[PDB]
Amino acid sequence: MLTDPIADMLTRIRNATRVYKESTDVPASRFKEEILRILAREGFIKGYERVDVDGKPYLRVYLKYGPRRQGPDPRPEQVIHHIRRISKPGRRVYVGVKEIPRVRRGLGIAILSTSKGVLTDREARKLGVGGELICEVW
Amino acid sequence: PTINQLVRKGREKVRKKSKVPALKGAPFRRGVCTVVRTVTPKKPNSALRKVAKVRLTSGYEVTAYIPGEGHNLQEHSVVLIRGGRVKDLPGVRYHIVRGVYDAAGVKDRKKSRSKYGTKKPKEA
RNA sequence: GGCUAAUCCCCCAUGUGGACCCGCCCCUUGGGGUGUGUCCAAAGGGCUUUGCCCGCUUCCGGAUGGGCCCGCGUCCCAUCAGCUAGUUGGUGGGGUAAUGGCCCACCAAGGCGACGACGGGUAGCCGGUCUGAGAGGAUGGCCGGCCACAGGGGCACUGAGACACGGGCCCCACUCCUACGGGAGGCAGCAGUUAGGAAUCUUCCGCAAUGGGCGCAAGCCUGACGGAGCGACGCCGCUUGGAGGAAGAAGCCCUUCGGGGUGUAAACUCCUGAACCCGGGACGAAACCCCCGACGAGGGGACUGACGGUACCGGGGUAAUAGCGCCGGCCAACUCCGUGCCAGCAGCCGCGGUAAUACGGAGGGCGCGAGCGUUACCCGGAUUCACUGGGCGUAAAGGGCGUGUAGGCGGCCUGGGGCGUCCCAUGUGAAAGACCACGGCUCAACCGUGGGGGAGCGUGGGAUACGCUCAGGCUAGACGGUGGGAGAGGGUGGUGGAAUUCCCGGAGUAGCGGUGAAAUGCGCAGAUACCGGGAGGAACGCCGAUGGCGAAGGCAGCCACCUGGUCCACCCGUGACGCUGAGGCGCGAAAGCGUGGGGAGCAAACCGGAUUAGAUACCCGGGUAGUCCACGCCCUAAACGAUGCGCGCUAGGUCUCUGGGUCUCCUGGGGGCCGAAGCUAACGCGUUAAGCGCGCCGCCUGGGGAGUACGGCCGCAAGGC
RNA sequence: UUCCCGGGCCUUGUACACACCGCCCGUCACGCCAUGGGAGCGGGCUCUACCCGAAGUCGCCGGGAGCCUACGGGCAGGCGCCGAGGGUAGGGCCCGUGACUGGGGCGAAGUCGUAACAAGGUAGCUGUACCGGAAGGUGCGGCUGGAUCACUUUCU
Numbered sequence A: 001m002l003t004d005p006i007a008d009m010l011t012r013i014r015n016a017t018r019v020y021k022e023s024t025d026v027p028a029s030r031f032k033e034e035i036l037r038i039l040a041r042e043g044f045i046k047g048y049e050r051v052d053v054d055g056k057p058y059l060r061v062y063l064k065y066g067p068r069r070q071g072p073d074p075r076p077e078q079v080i081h082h083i084r085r086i087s088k089p090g091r092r093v094y095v096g097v098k099e100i101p102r103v104r105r106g107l108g109i110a111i112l113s114t115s116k117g118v119l120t121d122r123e124a125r126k127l128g129v130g131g132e133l134i135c136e137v138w
Numbered sequence B: 001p002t003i004n005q006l007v008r009k010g011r012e013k014v015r016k017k018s019k020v021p022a023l024k025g026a027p028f029r030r031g032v033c034t035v036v037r038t039v040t041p042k043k044p045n046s047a048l049r050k051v052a053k054v055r056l057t058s059g060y061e062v063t064a065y066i067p068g069e070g071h072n073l074q075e076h077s078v079v080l081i082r083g084g085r086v087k088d089l090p091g092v093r094y095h096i097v098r099g100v101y102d103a104a105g106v107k108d109r110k111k112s113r114s115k116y117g118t119k120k121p122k123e124a
Numbered sequence C: 001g002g003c004u005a006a007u008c009c010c011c012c013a014u015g016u017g018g019a020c021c022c023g024c025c026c027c028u029u030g031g032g033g034u035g036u037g038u039c040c041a042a043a044g045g046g047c048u049u050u051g052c053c054c055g056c057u058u059c060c061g062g063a064u065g066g067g068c069c070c071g072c073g074u075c076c077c078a079u080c081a082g083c084u085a086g087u088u089g090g091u092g093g094g095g096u097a098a099u100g101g102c103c104c105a106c107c108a109a110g111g112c113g114a115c116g117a118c119g120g121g122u123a124g125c126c127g128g129u130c131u132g133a134g135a136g137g138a139u140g141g142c143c144g145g146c147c148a149c150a151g152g153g154g155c156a157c158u159g160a161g162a163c164a165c166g167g168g169c170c171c172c173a174c175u176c177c178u179a180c181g182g183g184a185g186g187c188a189g190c191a192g193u194u195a196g197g198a199a200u201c202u203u204c205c206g207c208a209a210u211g212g213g214c215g216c217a218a219g220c221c222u223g224a225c226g227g228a229g230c231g232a233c234g235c236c237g238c239u240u241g242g243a244g245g246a247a248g249a250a251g252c253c254c255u256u257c258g259g260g261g262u263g264u265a266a267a268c269u270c271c272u273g274a275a276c277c278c279g280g281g282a283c284g285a286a287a288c289c290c291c292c293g294a295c296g297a298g299g300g301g302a303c304u305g306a307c308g309g310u311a312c313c314g315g316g317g318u319a320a321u322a323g324c325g326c327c328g329g330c331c332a333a334c335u336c337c338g339u340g341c342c343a344g345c346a347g348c349c350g351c352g353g354u355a356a357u358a359c360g361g362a363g364g365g366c367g368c369g370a371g372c373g374u375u376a377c378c379c380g381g382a383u384u385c386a387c388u389g390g391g392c393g394u395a396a397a398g399g400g401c402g403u404g405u406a407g408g409c410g411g412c413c414u415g416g417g418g419c420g421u422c423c424c425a426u427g428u429g430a431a432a433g434a435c436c437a438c439g440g441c442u443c444a445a446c447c448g449u450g451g452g453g454g455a456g457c458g459u460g461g462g463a464u465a466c467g468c469u470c471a472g473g474c475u476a477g478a479c480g481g482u483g484g485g486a487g488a489g490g491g492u493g494g495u496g497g498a499a500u501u502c503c504c505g506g507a508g509u510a511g512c513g514g515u516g517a518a519a520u521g522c523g524c525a526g527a528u529a530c531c532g533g534g535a536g537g538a539a540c541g542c543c544g545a546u547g548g549c550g551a552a553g554g555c556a557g558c559c560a561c562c563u564g565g566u567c568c569a570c571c572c573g574u575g576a577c578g579c580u581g582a583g584g585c586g587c588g589a590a591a592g593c594g595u596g597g598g599g600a601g602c603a604a605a606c607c608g609g610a611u612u613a614g615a616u617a618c619c620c621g622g623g624u625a626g627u628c629c630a631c632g633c634c635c636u637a638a639a640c641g642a643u644g645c646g647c648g649c650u651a652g653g654u655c656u657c658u659g660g661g662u663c664u665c666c667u668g669g670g671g672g673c674c675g676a677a678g679c680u681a682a683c684g685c686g687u688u689a690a691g692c693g694c695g696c697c698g699c700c701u702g703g704g705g706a707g708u709a710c711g712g713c714c715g716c717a718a719g720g721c
Numbered sequence D: 001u002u003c004c005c006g007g008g009c010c011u012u013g014u015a016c017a018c019a020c021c022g023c024c025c026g027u028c029a030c031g032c033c034a035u036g037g038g039a040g041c042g043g044g045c046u047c048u049a050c051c052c053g054a055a056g057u058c059g060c061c062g063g064g065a066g067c068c069u070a071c072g073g074g075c076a077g078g079c080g081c082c083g084a085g086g087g088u089a090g091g092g093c094c095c096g097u098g099a100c101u102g103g104g105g106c107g108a109a110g111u112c113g114u115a116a117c118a119a120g121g122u123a124g125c126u127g128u129a130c131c132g133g134a135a136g137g138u139g140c141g142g143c144u145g146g147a148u149c150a151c152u153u154u155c156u
């Protein structure tokens, strides 16, 4: 089995985008889906949808990129330049609202998991709560 | 190492070892000169350097460089040593303070006088 | 021995009350109430003397101070791994203000430890302090808090309180007194002496102020303290002058010998005027007390200054200390002379052996300035122990491999709980310090007032995504079934042919052998070469590979038996049963060791022949251990892919081994090569990762000393870890 | 065109770079220094057993043996447990010194050969084992981190 399904996902995505895949499938879990929603809403992916690869539930994650480019190497810029796991089995990271980070002076996001559900570093700061710092994305 | 490992063994702090067992850390130590030889520098250099075996109050005996143009240290001179090796004479790690006790200051010195115990040239 | 007072001791009484035993009630560990029984009080003094003051007794409560207990936190060494008998607990006592093995009887046989017991080292802890962007590192001096000690060890007495620094008792070491029996003493109080040391002050003034003890008070005591003294030891403030002065004195230093520099710097001119001399001269000090009032509230008056004739104000008034380091790069500042691997410099790199910006001096210059340098030590830079924030193919670093304990980590869905996690409120977080603001000394240092923070912990309430836990469910992980497959995987027994050596027989004759060339050697007791027969040991040609099997080491004729791993198909069964794995256990090439056996060939040592300058080698002829088998040890290695195991993700092309399929091709497992993206110091790696990621283990931290020494463990030893 | 000398181009190995007349290894000699083992002789700690045991609290006695007494009891005194400390025997650890002894680091120009680096002139390295003035040689097995296609010959 996978030891960390969220990191598995964050990477399937990190990988897929580096070779400009169209979409990418990841085994499904409510928690994973919950993270995609933030991912979608903040405009990092085009969105996702439940599908059934073989006989088991996955989540096509439609990736998104910038426009073709000039000079050598026309490959487009990435929407997801950076996506990294923070809390991990073996080293869970929890923060208080006063301790929620600020990814790239705001140009990026942190996805916390609170008792008020999965939120971004703002949705969390707004609702005045903290929790498990899941990852940062920019 | 894994975090579990750092939790199990942790990092190990670096213990810095001295280059001046002038004991008590002390800035200086007093001693009496046993021998008052001369030594040959290593490879790149050549000359007759003035050293001095010293028996310290520290309860130690070590060679100490005698800086300056010319000295006056016999076999029973009361000397004060300080840290400071001499890169050329392996084994010499301290300097005698010219201007304290028996080791007279350097004469006709006019530049770096304080470093050689030579009082401000009289007259105007 | 004798006399004697009391707020000294005792007896009887009174009993608000309180203590004790027993019972009852509430309450809940010994808290509060109630009843009977018993037990327990006291001190007088002064008067402005018959009414106040000071004091006494018992009890309840407050306030302050403190004892004991508990959670969590608190350095180094595992080259310290087992520790423990009052030890762990129980019953009953003793003891105390009080719980408790605190102590004692008796009973039980427990308690502690890799989450580091026990042992060894080191050390008062904290608020804070220094450093750092922070995290962190280092640190605990002054000041404030707690602890401990008072020559060293032990002990109790008195008391609200001590096991008592200037109280007592004993032992010990020391100093002093001694009419030798025996006594006296303890500066880690202030000041001072001496010793040690690189180094740390006055045998000062005062009790005026704040604080303390006793007293009704007057007041006494206070080396606590308030001051002064010494030391640039630190911090802050200040002075050694200000303005004008030559297309620029002299001297000195360079020079292209024209001139350039020190430099408006100096002399001079004018101005101010630190020091010093006069005059004045303080805040800190208003209470205690006395008078009025009521000994209260309130009002009034008096005394009191160590610092000190100091601060400060006013008058007068001189132009009057500058040093230290550095100038090759890092690093700001350059020239002449001197010296010639010398004398010397040196933080690192290095500099000096005839024209040295690096040694020494001088001129000039940079830096800083009552200081400047040096040494020592702490943090920094050092993401160089990397939590923030590092690494291990070839740089130091993957454990020789497996099995597996603890531990760390854990797929999808639902539910309860709410330990972690998060939120709110609240308490706590002393003062000083730190931060901000305003303010007091002419400023500042310093100081006052005020404000703002703060992690952690306690309490109450709340949330439930993630982690945890419990309960239920699932099949995508893992395992199992059925049917197929490939293989030098392992163990035991048997067995085949080639060759070498030896022995026997035949036939045959002068050499064979060996090298660069030779010789030693073997051969007429007939060798070599050839044929036939026999014995024995060891190893398996071709197939054979660029191949296969195994966890590694490793595994190769053929046959049988016993036995391990593994791949594919079918989706059949279980239902997260998983990954990793400190220690443990097992395996582990060669050489080597022990016992016994074997011994053809080969061959350390060794014996000889050559070679060479020598030749304890290379070459040649011999040859013992060993190489082989059994059993038992050893436990190493370039034990290598120099690449730990597992899982998911990220172009392809090509060769190949083994399986399945609709069999040009597809699909699974393994072995190679070239390469996408990406990674890498580069080389290179690249679905067989050295890519992108998660989990767990092992390991690295400059080189030599050294895989050494010591210790421990293991081994018969060699020697291993 | 094999060989000797000089040279040109490509390639390969290299530990060389005032560049093979390069580099470099170990023994030994000389000097300075730190250090291991170590008979014995000193100093210290600690633990076990047995023995002696001050002060003091506590316990028992306190009697025709003492003092007080309102006869209840108190004090003196005595004995005992514990007890600082000391002694003896043994056990373990540390420390100073130490005859004798092992190797090590460092020090311009001493000695011996030539092991390594190029196929280093016998490829090297390696674990082990024996042997040798020294580097090292040889045996067995392993590795590639070995050059090309297939007499011997030191040094600077």
Ligand SMILES: NC[C@@H]1O[C@H](O[C@H]2[C@@H](O)[C@H](O[C@@H]3[C@@H](O)[C@H](N)C[C@H](N)[C@H]3O[C@H]3O[C@H](CO)[C@@H](O)[C@H](O)[C@H]3N)O[C@@H]2CO)[C@H](N)[C@@H](O)[C@@H]1O
Pocket: D026, D030, D107, D110
């Ligand atoms: N210090 C080197 C160590 O000892 C040995 O080396 C030592 C000796 O072999 C060596 O001696 C050399 C000699 O080899 C060479 N052929 C001649 C030279 N004169 C000697 O030199 C030695 O002695 C002289 C005085 O005579 C000193 O001035 C010099 O500094 C010193 N190294 O000097 C070393 C001592 O300094 C090891 N071989 C070496 O691997 C190890 O690292």
Ligand SMILES: [K+]
Pocket: none
């Ligand atoms: K009397």
Ligand SMILES: [K+]
Pocket: none
């Ligand atoms: K009563």
Ligand SMILES: [K+]
Pocket: none
């Ligand atoms: K009270």
Ligand SMILES: [K+]
Pocket: none
């Ligand atoms: K109280």
Ligand SMILES: [K+]
Pocket: none
């Ligand atoms: K209390």
Ligand SMILES: [K+]
Pocket: none
């Ligand atoms: K008890």
Ligand SMILES: [K+]
Pocket: C134, C135, C388
């Ligand atoms: K930080």
Ligand SMILES: [K+]
Pocket: none
């Ligand atoms: K600290």
Ligand SMILES: [K+]
Pocket: none
């Ligand atoms: K500390």
Ligand SMILES: [K+]
Pocket: none
């Ligand atoms: K601290």
Ligand SMILES: [K+]
Pocket: none
């Ligand atoms: K009073």
Ligand SMILES: [K+]
Pocket: none
């Ligand atoms: K009054």
Ligand SMILES: [K+]
Pocket: none
């Ligand atoms: K004045």
Ligand SMILES: [K+]
Pocket: C319
């Ligand atoms: K002047």
Ligand SMILES: [K+]
Pocket: C354
């Ligand atoms: K000259």
